[PDB]
């Protein structure tokens, strides 16, 4: 029925005007008086030299000391950042890993990729070796992202256009989030873990309610695939990095884009995105091989993290905010401070 | 300055490093092949002669081949094709009989052009398999090749038609100086396909070694 299609367009226009009336003053205008952060000079405090292939994902532990990194050499490595020591080296059944996660409790890590399976590994067993706890199957596309809610819950992003919430002990999809029209590439849990935002290849970001499993909001503005997404520390906003060489900040309550982080001389895609503990700095990885530090409130480039010889694929900030970890398509993780 | 437990942790990290080095050395001497095809172009038969990604491991003349098939991996291809940058070679399967319809040969040509000129496969040689020799041979005498290639100007025989198809596929590649295309007609079913793959892989490995030594 073409009438239903017409009604959808009319509703789409209605919501566009609804959030248009709420756009009285831009963020730039509001933050035009605060002093700039100046220059952010971050030095490579540590280099991790264990992986032998491209690093595709890394995640910080909640203790801000142990981080897990995923590389296509078929290994998950848990690093002790302070001493650079390798705590664990987990061989993966499938070497085509694309995502990594670290349970907030620290007892588990998650892995996934082109195998369409999210593997849960038990890091604390009486046998002294890391063991595969569960293998979550049900996605028809590669595993894009995964994030633990707790020791028994995990939300996974998949290239089959859907996101899912799993019950690890049973290994079943408790909830399925099906709103997107393209591959879902990124995933970010809110601080309270009551919801989460996903970015997909349809150039849109969607806000989901984990309890009810329903797209609460949809955000547009990007011109290409969204590869990275990361909620604000406050939890009332999130930032997205896409293939159009642009990062933008969306606010849930305002329900529209707030700021755009782009430069004329940047023409490559964004691979990762993260915020500072205060949310004042937006750190984004690029295909330029160097990460970029943006003043999240003024949209001014505050610094550059140029320490990688290949594409920066992953990027994370410790919970205490002390340091930033960057992984790239070379086999090295770098810690900055 | 390190504590006793710190020293023990460092020793454990050292052992992990040694194991990682051993695993990397083991993996560096293995041949990685990426299997591609437009559709039912003969991938299944070539896999027979030897979820998402399917890995097939086989040993030939003391050389271990891991061949990855991504036919079941239905999704944006540009979002995970770069995962295979650095594979030893690409095995492209084309149904030589899929020229009448339905156009199918044109889709195979489009996929071959996309893969060969991909930014991630500039230096990756491709092994071209032209399957279904017999069926194409029978069909050529009945359905002329002009259906697929109107510009074709030659006798409607198996040899000339196959040569023309191979020439078109080989000319579909732009960077002829940084990569090679090895073409085979795979219907013998006499262990010749695996021998051809082995020969092409050894040639590619020798070329890569020459490049590393700066000779190329």
């Amino acid at each position, epitope marked *: 029925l073409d009438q239903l299609r017409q009604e959808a367009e009319q509703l789409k226009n209605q919501i566009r005007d609804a959030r248009k009336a709420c756009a009285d003053a831009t963020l730039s205008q509001i933050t035009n008086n605060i002093d700039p952060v100046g220059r952010i000079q971050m030095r490579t405090r540590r280099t991790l030299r264990g992986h032998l292939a491209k690093i595709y994902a890394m995640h910080w532990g909640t203790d801000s000391r142990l981080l897990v990194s995923a590389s296509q050499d078929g290994k998950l490595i848990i690093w002790d950042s302070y001493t650079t020591n390798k705590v664990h080296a987990i061989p993966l059944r499938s070497s085509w890993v694309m995502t990594c996660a670290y349970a907030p409790s*620290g007892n588990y890590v998650a892995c996934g990729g082109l195998d369409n399976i999210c593997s849960i590994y038990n890091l604390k067993t*009486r046998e002294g070796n890391v063991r595969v706890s569960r293998e979550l199957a049900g996605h028809t596309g590669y595993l894009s992202c995964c994030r633990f809610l707790d020791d028994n819950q995990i939300v996974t992003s998949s290239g089959d256009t859907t996101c899912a919430l799993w019950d690890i002990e049973t290994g079943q999809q408790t909830t399925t989030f099906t709103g997107h029209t393209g591959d879902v590439m990124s995933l970010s849990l809110a601080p309270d873990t009551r919801l989460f935002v996903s970015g997909a290849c349809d150039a849109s970001a969607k806000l989901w309610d984990v309890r009810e499993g329903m797209c609460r909001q949809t955000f547009t503005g990007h011109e290409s695939d969204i590869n990275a997404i990361c909620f604000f520390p406050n939890g009332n906003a999130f930032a997205t990095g896409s293939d159009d060489a642009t990062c933008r900040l969306f606010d849930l309550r305002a329900d529209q884009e707030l700021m755009t982080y782009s430069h004329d001389n940047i023409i490559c895609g964004i691979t990762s995105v993260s915020f500072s503990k205060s949310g004042r700095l937006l750190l984004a990885g690029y295909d330029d091989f160097n990460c970029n530090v943006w003043d999240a409130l003024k949209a001014d480039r505050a610094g550059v993290l140029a320490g990688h010889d290949n594409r920066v694929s992953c990027l994370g900030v410790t919970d205490d905010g002390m340091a930033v970890a960057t992984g790239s398509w070379d086999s090295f993780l770098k810690i900055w401070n | 300055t390190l*504590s*006793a437990e710190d020293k023990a*942790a460092v020793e454990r990290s050292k052992m992990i490093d040694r194991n990682l080095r051993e695993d990397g050395e083991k993996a560096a001497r293995e041949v990685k092949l990426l299997l591609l095809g437009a559709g039912e172009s003969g991938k299944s038969t070539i896999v027979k002669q030897m979820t998402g990604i399917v890995e097939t491991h086989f040993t030939f003349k003391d050389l271990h081949f891991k061949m990855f098939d991504v036919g079941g991996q239905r999704s944006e291809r540009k979002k995970w094709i770069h995962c295979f940058e650095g594979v030893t070679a690409i095995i492209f399967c084309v149904a030589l009989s899929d020229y009448d319809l339905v156009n199918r040969m044109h889709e195979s040509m489009k996929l071959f052009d996309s893969i060969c000129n991909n930014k991630w496969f500039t230096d990756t040689s491709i092994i071209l398999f032209l399957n279904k020799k017999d069926l194409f041979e029978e069909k050529i005498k009945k359905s002329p090749l002009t259906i697929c290639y109107p510009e074709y100007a030659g006798s409607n025989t198996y040899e000339e038609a196959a040569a023309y198809i191979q020439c078109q596929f080989e000319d579909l590649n732009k960077r002829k100086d940084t990569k090679e295309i090895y073409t085979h007609f795979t219907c013998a079913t006499d262990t010749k396909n695996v021998q051809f793959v082995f020969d092409a892989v050894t040639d590619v490995i020798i070329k890569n070694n020459l490049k590393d030594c700066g000779l190329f």
Partner: single-chain antibody
Amino acid sequence: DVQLVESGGGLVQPGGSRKLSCSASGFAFSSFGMHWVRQAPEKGLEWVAYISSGSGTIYYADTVKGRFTISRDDPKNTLFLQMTSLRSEDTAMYYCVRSIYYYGSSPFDFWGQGTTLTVSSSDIVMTQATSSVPVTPGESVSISCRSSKSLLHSNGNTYLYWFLQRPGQSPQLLIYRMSNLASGVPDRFSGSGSGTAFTLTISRLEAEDVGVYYCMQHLEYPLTFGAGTKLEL
């Protein structure tokens, strides 16, 4: 099922030789550093030797160096202690102890059942002043241990370990690094203190808690144990 079974103990004439074996089962033996701990017939624990994972590092107590040899057969999941020139002072029960060392790990977590050997006829000092103290179920008691040298390290760790040896049983790890509760230990046990002064507090003490409590330092080798505080009643 993480048992360690020791064998090879028995009567041996003075000056003889004897090899003790320890068959590991139910865990990744090659991933654990192994210790030999000794307990005279009516005295406290005494660390003997240590072999690291991969056999890279080996340590011996000054009273057995040159006489004892520690070795492990990782494929066979066995730990060996070759004793030569045995003296009357070597008569004791020998315990096979596994310990894994990484950030956040729990060394000395599992002890074997022990094998008895009877011979016919700079070190950090850990002090436990209270050799014994009566206790009643439901009450709270605190065990005191003291160190001659500060166990706090520049990395922030205080390398003190608490072990409980119930009557006729192998020692069991309670607290590692003075603050962390070992896996499977109830929340009643608590460890606190500063460098050179540590306390083990038991809240609502009940049955199964009577025994000898030992404090061990892991700051540097040789590992030294306290005299041991006994609970009864």
